């Protein structure tokens, strides 16, 4: 593939040469990008929440930052060459910050960025979080080093809604109170 990443060996440490990656979720925003076919419209997209204090057992909005982290490793696999795959140190550049909790100016729901039942393999976000458009190298619970540095970098992000549904399956509710008010009275709760 790319010859600039020629050493396919494991990284020296999980701290690539700071915050902890929490997970991912979905948002919808009102787009204002003049000259674009999606001007004055609504766009849904994936964001990643990085916990920046954690329930582990061991900057400003409208700004682009680059995240340096170790790629998730998958072990040996058989350029038609067999060897280590993943656990590489990678720097990903131009990732716009969307939020520095889950309630927007259009969504009047007093809710938190943490989803229903918390993230998968990661608890609730009890501290400050950085919500970055797109995907960041490294899996959940990894340590990611955030760093500073086209009309994209100057765009103002007006959040409209944040998806706080349970990632632990095909969730359909944003808050436990919403689920309780939808289903109604259960046999246990009587």
């Amino acid at each position: 593939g790319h010859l600039g990443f020629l050493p396919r060996k494991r990284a020296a440490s999980i701290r690539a040469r700071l915050g902890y990656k929490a997970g991912m979720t979905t948002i919808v925003r009102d787009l204002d990008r003049p000259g674009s076919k999606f001007h004055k419209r609504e766009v849904v997209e994936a964001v990643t929440v990085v916990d920046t204090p954690t329930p582990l057992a061991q900057f400003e909005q409208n700004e682009m930052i680059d995240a340096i982290a170790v790629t998730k490793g998958h072990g040996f696999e058989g350029v038609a060459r067999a060897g280590q795959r993943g656990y590489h140190s990678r720097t990903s550049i131009n990732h716009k910050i969307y939020r520095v909790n889950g309630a927007t100016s259009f969504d009047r729901t007093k809710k938190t960025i943490t989803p229903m039942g918390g993230f998968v393999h990661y608890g609730e976000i009890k501290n400050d979080f950085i919500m970055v458009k797109g995907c960041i190298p490294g899996n959940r619970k990894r340590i990611v080093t955030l760093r500073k540095s086209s009309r994209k970098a100057l765009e103002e992000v007006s959040l409209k809604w944040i998806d706080t549904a349970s990632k632990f399956g095909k969730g359909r509710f944003q808050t436990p109170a919403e689920k309780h008010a939808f289903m109604g009275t259960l046999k246990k709760d009587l």
């Binding site: 979905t26 919808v28 849904v44 809604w161 998806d163 549904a165 095909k170 359909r172 939808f182």
Partner: peptide, 26 residues
């Protein structure tokens, strides 16, 4: 009849110009 949120589910458009919105693959 469960709520459908932006992104979740898949919508089927019949030839009859009728839209069926779903919340799950179930």
């Amino acid at each position: 009849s469960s709520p459908c949120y932006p992104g979740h589910g898949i919508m089927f458009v019949r030839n009859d110009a009728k839209e069926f919105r779903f919340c799950r693959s179930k």
